[PDB]
Amino acid sequence: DNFNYKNDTKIIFGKDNYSEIGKNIKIFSKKTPKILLHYEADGELIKKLGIYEKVISSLKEFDIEFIELGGVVPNPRLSLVYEGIKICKEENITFILAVGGASVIDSAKAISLGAVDNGDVWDFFTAKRIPQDTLGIGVVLTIPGAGSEMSESSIITDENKKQKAVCDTEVNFPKFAILNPEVCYTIPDRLMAAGIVDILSHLMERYFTKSIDTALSDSLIEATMKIVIKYGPLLMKDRKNYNYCSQIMWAATMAHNGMIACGRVADWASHRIEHEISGIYDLTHGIGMAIIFPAWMKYTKNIRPQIFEKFFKEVFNTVNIDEGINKLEEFFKSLGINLKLSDYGITEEYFSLMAEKALGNSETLGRFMQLNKQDIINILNLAK
């Protein structure tokens, strides 16, 4: 069935290329750029990693005037967005450079909307208004993650009204994103393993679909998943290997860009179940996906067995579904991930509560298979 695809963001991929920062600010800003340099907390991380000094040097090299605004926190707050909008208007900022991860990127996106607007930027987040323009941002991606550096979404929390909202609109696409696989080198092992699983999970969530006539999309997703399964374990054992990091970072980009997934309906059941686990327990998202996704596959293996056979044949070289599921679990273990909830002190105590919360006001969740409350509890039991 029909689909539309568009992604506006210029990708600048590779290393030893920090002059790309100044070059691309000049490309996308009004002449005589004057940029807001935005980052997390007081920049202590990107400073010790040496990323701060390389950014500053590139700005000096191109005579770009800049004002710094730090203080972003992991769930970016509207109060800092309002402050950045004030600074942008007051100081005639022409462009925003977000140096950080998803939280810095989304805060920059929100400031960029408000800076060229004469109203309350929170209207864009509460469906009161549809933004028609942005100032424009560029991203120096310091921590890989869910792909905000090339998405049209911004997630901001109004901490006073304790409300978290999304603005998803075309003008939010960053003008450019600088992706250097070297930023992976310093991520702790456990979070790198979780991030590898996040990439595979994102692809699998689009792959297992009842949509039809998706042969080329199947092949592109399979190719990308196979690279994650092949290179993930090598990256984990050779963390400063630029080749390995490059294949995994580009696989993440392919998954997030999403053009290889055009034409198919995704299923968020595993994501939603895992969400409730991490809501109660201190469980990294990717670790929870490694536990939950194989349990979801077992439970839904009868909906469309031919697509599971194709998955395990094309990705794991076996048509045997049970053997393929074991190979998938073995893959997770090879990243250092334990695969039972009880390995983390998670008992069955809150299973029914997590199922109830996952469902909310609906009687079922999921698209590939519609799962009721007891179905979800069965999946948690498969994962216990």
Side-chain angles (χ1 to χ4, degrees), residues 1-322 324-384:
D1 42 46
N2 301 2
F3 64 86
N4 300 335
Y5 165 83
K6 183 185 201 225
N7 190 300
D8 275 52
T9 300
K10 176 179 175 183
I11 302 298
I12 296 122
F13 191 90
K15 58 165 167 189
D16 303 327
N17 61 342
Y18 283 87
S19 79
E20 292 279 12
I21 298 175
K23 294 192 172 294
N24 281 276
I25 288 171
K26 303 222 300 194
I27 281 168
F28 289 102
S29 167
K30 175 274 167 271
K31 196 24 57 199
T32 326
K34 177 173 176 194
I35 68 106
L36 184 76
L37 176 57
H38 203 38
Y39 50 77
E40 275 259 322
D42 47 53
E44 66 281 304
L45 184 279
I46 63 176
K47 275 167 173 161
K48 196 192 42 203
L49 300 212
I51 301 183
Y52 178 87
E53 300 87 299
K54 303 193 190 173
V55 167
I56 297 313
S57 177
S58 180
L59 298 173
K60 173 133 201 104
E61 182 206 339
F62 287 84
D63 300 330
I64 295 162
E65 192 191 354
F66 68 93
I67 293 169
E68 305 193 24
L69 176 61
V72 179
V73 296
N75 286 296
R77 283 166 178 202
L78 175 52
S79 52
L80 192 60
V81 171
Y82 279 141
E83 179 70 17
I85 291 163
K86 192 183 68 160
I87 290 173
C88 278
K89 291 176 176 176
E90 260 161 52
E91 307 299 329
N92 302 274
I93 299 306
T94 71
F95 201 76
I96 300 157
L97 191 72
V99 185
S103 61
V104 177
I105 295 157
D106 283 9
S107 176
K109 283 176 181 180
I111 299 172
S112 182
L113 292 165
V116 300
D117 183 65
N118 60 3
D120 188 353
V121 72
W122 197 237
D123 293 355
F124 305 142
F125 287 77
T126 59
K128 302 196 200 87
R129 293 192 292 132
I130 289 180
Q132 294 300 112
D133 195 26
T134 37
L135 193 63
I137 85 176
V139 177
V140 180
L141 192 63
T142 67
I143 308 143
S148 199
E149 70 280 4
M150 64 193 70
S151 86
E152 50 179 7
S153 301
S154 171
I155 308 312
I156 299 295
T157 77
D158 195 318
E159 192 52 59
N160 272 99
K161 313 123 174 191
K162 254 212 61 183
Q163 204 201 333
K164 188 155 129 173
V166 58
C167 178
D168 191 322
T169 188
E170 202 282 330
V171 294
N172 274 345
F173 277 127
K175 306 307 183 187
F176 66 87
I178 291 169
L179 309 191
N180 181 356
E182 289 182 329
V183 306
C184 299
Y185 293 174
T186 53
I187 300 169
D189 273 4
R190 174 176 153 111
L191 301 174
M192 184 76 235
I196 289 164
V197 177
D198 287 340
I199 301 162
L200 187 64
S201 293
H202 190 97
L203 295 159
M204 291 186 303
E205 288 164 345
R206 276 121 185 109
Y207 187 83
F208 296 113
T209 188
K210 290 184 298 183
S211 301
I212 51 89
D213 291 356
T214 62
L216 172 58
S217 179
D218 290 1
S219 296
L220 296 163
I221 297 174
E222 287 153 11
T224 307
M225 291 184 307
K226 285 201 80 164
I227 282 290
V228 175
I229 283 154
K230 177 176 181 174
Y231 280 90
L234 316 179
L235 184 161
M236 291 303 300
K237 301 300 173 61
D238 199 358
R239 297 291 318 277
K240 297 190 172 56
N241 186 303
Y242 184 78
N243 175 215
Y244 299 167
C245 293
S246 285
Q247 304 320 128
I248 295 295
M249 173 166 285
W250 192 236
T253 302
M254 292 301 302
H256 297 335
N257 161 278
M259 182 170 72
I260 59 160
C262 289
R264 66 204 303 132
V265 183
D267 183 292
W268 310 100
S270 288
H271 186 262
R272 179 75 169 159
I273 298 170
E274 198 292 319
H275 175 77
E276 305 302 343
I277 300 173
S278 290
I280 294 184
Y281 301 93
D282 176 22
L283 197 63
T284 306
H285 176 269
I287 302 317
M289 294 308 291
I291 296 166
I292 288 307
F293 224 110
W296 176 91
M297 291 187 80
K298 293 167 185 178
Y299 204 73
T300 65
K301 77 206 309 160
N302 295 321
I303 292 295
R304 192 187 177 168
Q306 286 178 46
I307 190 68
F308 280 38
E309 297 180 50
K310 189 176 186 179
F311 174 77
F312 287 114
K313 174 55 175 194
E314 298 296 323
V315 178
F316 286 100
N317 196 28
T318 180
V319 297
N320 191 294
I321 290 182
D322 291 349
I325 287 171
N326 182 238
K327 286 171 137 270
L328 174 59
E329 281 158 341
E330 281 184 50
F331 162 75
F332 291 140
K333 288 197 51 204
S334 81
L335 309 176
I337 301 178
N338 294 321
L339 295 193
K340 295 177 202 276
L341 291 167
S342 66
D343 295 338
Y344 300 82
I346 300 177
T347 70
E348 305 155 49
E349 181 186 348
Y350 294 113
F351 281 7
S352 67
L353 175 64
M354 295 192 295
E356 291 158 17
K357 290 215 264 163
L359 286 169
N361 302 137
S362 319
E363 202 77 354
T364 64
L365 62 79
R367 301 82 203 167
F368 187 69
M369 172 173 186
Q370 293 182 332
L371 301 161
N372 60 31
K373 175 180 176 171
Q374 186 59 41
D375 290 328
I376 297 161
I377 293 168
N378 288 337
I379 287 166
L380 293 168
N381 284 344
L382 286 167
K384 82 194 217 311

